[model samples]
Target: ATFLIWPIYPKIEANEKATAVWLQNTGKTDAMVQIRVFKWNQDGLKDNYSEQSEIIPSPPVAKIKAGEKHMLRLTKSVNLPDGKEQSYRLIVDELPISKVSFQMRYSIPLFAYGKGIGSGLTEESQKLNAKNALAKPVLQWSVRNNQQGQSELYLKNNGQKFARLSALKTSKTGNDISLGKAAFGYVLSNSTVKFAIDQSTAHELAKTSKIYGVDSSGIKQELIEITKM
Candidate 1:
C-alpha cells in the first residue's frame, strides 16, 4: 500500500474555517480510500472517539489512480467557542482491492483553535501564533512498580495540549538503553498514561535519573527527570 499523505499534523487556524489534506497513491494499482472524522477526548487516561458532524470532510470516499493524488477538504460547519482548543482525529482507511488483500489504516490528529484565540494578521504569523498558542505540553514523569510486579513508566500531561513522545531512551553508567521506538505513543492533555517496562530496561532505568525522548515537534530530543514512585 504505497499511499502517501501530507500534513500528518493538520490544524484549523483560529481565523480559518477549513483546511486541506492531500493523499497520493504511488502503488502500481489504483486505490480506494475512506476518510472519517471523529471527536477525540480522553477519559480516565483512555482515548475516546465519537462521530461528529461539526467538521465535515468533503468527498469522504474516493478512488485515486496510480501515481495520482486527491485533495480532501475539511471544513468546520460551526464556530467554536473562545479559549480552549478542540481535538479531532482523521481516520483514513485504504480499502482492500480483493478479499485476500490486506488493508491499511492511518489515524491522524486534527486540532482546532477557538475564535480569536491564536489568530494573526498574516498566514505565516498565524501559523507561528498557532504553534505558540498551545505552548509545549508539560509532562511529569515517574517510574513505579505495577501490581503485576513489573516496573512501569508513568507520564502525566499537566498542560492543555497533547504530547507526542518517541525515540525514548535512558542512560545508566554511560550506556544508553532504548525504551521505545521512534513511533512510541502520545499522552493526551490532562491525562496520565502508564507503559510497562521490560525487566532488563527497568533495571537499567532504575539506575538512571533522567530519560530522553523526542518531543511533539520531532525536532529536538529532550531530557526529562524521572521521579521514582
Candidate 2:
C-alpha cells in the first residue's frame, strides 16, 4: 500500500484553535497508519523531541481503504501565542500488515504562532499581507574546523522563527559544490547547527566563497559570510 500527505509544513494560527491534516491512500491495498505529536525544542545546537500532551490528534490510528483519504484533526488544549512561536513534529507511521512489507514513516513540522509572534512570510502569505513578517529567522553562516580538524558548515539562527534550509550550494575557485539533494537540514530559532562536509568539498570551502540555500519560503538566498570560530 502507498499513501501521501499534504501541507508538508502545517501551521496553527493564534486566532485559530485547530488545523486539518490529510492522508490519502493511493495503493491497491488497505493502509494502516498511526499519528503522533511531539514537542520540538533545541538543546545545545541539537534537536530535542519529547512527549507532549498540549496538542491532540484525533483518530490517532486508522485504516484507510485503497483510493480513500482521511482527515486528521489537530486540536490544542492550552492557550497559546504567549508572544512566541511554538514548534512540534507530527509523525505518521505506516504499519506493516504482512511480513514482507516495508514500513514507512513521515515527519512533518507544525508551527503555532499568534499575535506578537512572527509567522514569517511565505510566497502566498506575502501576497496578501507583508506586514505580518515580524518573526522571520536571521541566520549566520560560517565554515570552521572541528575538534577532529575536519571542516564543517555552521548555521546559527537568531530570530524567532525556525529556518528550513535546503538545496545548499557554494562556490570556490569558480567551481560549484553541492551539499546534497533538496534535504539539507534545519536550524531552529535561537539555535546553532553544524553540517558535515565531505573531505573533498570541505577543502574547497573558504571565507570568500558564496553560499546559496533555499529558505523556508522556497526562496533562493545568498547567505552572508561570518567569521569562523
Candidate 3:
C-alpha cells in the first residue's frame, strides 16, 4: 500500500518570492533525531540548479523528548524554477537513545503569496475602516470524526470588495507529493461556509493539512486563511 504525497502547488509566476516551510518533529521519550529535507534538480540535489531550489540548507537538528514536535524552517527563499518542476525530499534519520521507534513519512503543501503580510492583520485588511478591518475570518472547525471533514469559516468582508476562497490543497509532511479529492467553497461575504477535505485517510489530512484562500484576483492565491478541524 502507498500513501499520497502532497506538494504546495499554487501556480506561481516568475520572480514572485514565497516562503516554504518544512515541519520537522523533535521527538518523544528523550531521543536524539536529525532530519534533513532537500530537492532534486536532475543533478540529484547535488548539482546546483538555481537559488530557488536551494531554499532550505542544513535544516536545524531537532532533539525531541517524550511526545514533542519541532518546526524547522529554511533560511533561503522558495523560488520556483523557470518553467521547471519543483520537487523537495525530506530525509529524517533518527538516532534514538531512550524511545521506541515510530516512523511515519509524509509531506505538506505550500501556499505562495509574496511572503504574506503577517497572518495577524493583512496590509489590505488594515486600510479599511477600523470596524471593518477588525473583522476576523472566524472559523468553525469540523465535528465529525469518520467522514469528509469541514472547517466552517465565518468571514466578514467589509473592505468595499469581496474576499474569497479560490484554491486549496493538503499534505502530511513538509512539501512533497500531492493529495487529491479535497474540495471547498465560499458562501458569501459576511457569510458562513464549510471548507472540507478528504476525511477517510489516516495521515491527518484534515488536521495537519492547510487551508488557503484565493481572492477575486485571479491566478494568484492570497492564502487568506488557514485552520484545521
Candidate 4:
C-alpha cells in the first residue's frame, strides 16, 4: 500500500519568513499525488483557490516500492498583516491503489505578533510599544514522516489574523522523509486544510512526534506532537 505525511506543519507567527510541508510516498508501487495551497483574507474571508504549483516526480513515476517514500516542501512562508490571519491546505489525492483515497483534512492559524518574537522584541517593547524579536514566529515547517501505520498531522489558522512561518528540519525520526521540488513555501492563515501524515494500524513512530512551539523569551509555546501506536 501507499502513504503520505506532513512534517513541518506551519504555525505562521509575526516575522515568520517561510514554511515547509513534506509529502511522503510509502508503498510497494509508486503512486501519483497532487497538492495545492490557498489563502484567507481579513474579515475571516477566504481566497486564492489554486493548483498554483504542483509536484509530479519521475513521471509515470515507478513504484515508490514497498520500502520507499517522497517529500515536498514550500518556501514563500505565509505572511500577512497583524491581527489578520490566512489559511491553507496540504491536501492529498490518491492512496493505496487509488480506488477510494483518504480525504483527511485539518486546519492551522497564522498568528500575528502575539506579544514578541523573543527577548529582543520583549525587552524593546518596554522602550517602544513593541514585543520580542526572536519571539516572532519564523518557522518554515520543514520536516516530514511517511511510513505504514502513521498519522500525518497538519496546521491551520483556526483563528482570524495573519502570521509568518519559518524554521525547518527533519531526520531518521521519520520512517521515510524524501526531498524534492522547491522545498519551502508560505501557508495562508485561517483555513480548514489537511496535510500528509502516517495513518496506519501501527503508530506515530518518533521519540518526539511533535512540532513544539517556543516563545523567544523562553516560554514554552504550543507543542505540535503526533504519535501513532
The model with the greatest TM-score is 2
lDDT of 3: 0.37
Q: What's model 2's lDDT at 176?
A: 49
Question: For candidate 1, which ten residues in a row score worst on lDDT?
Answer: 217-226
lDDT of 2 at 14: 63
Residue-level lDDT for 183 in candidate 4 = 24
Index of the highest-lDDT prediction: 1
* Candidate 4 off by > 4 Å: 40-66, 77-79, 95-229
- Per-candidate local distance difference test: 0.71, 0.71, 0.37, 0.36
Per-residue lDDT tens digits for candidate 2, residues 13-78, read 666688899889999999888999999987765678999987898889998999998998889778
Could you give candidate 1's per-residue lDDT for residues 98-125 as a string of tens digits?
A: 3675677999998776654442324653
* Per-model TM-score versus the true fold: 0.78, 0.80, 0.30, 0.35
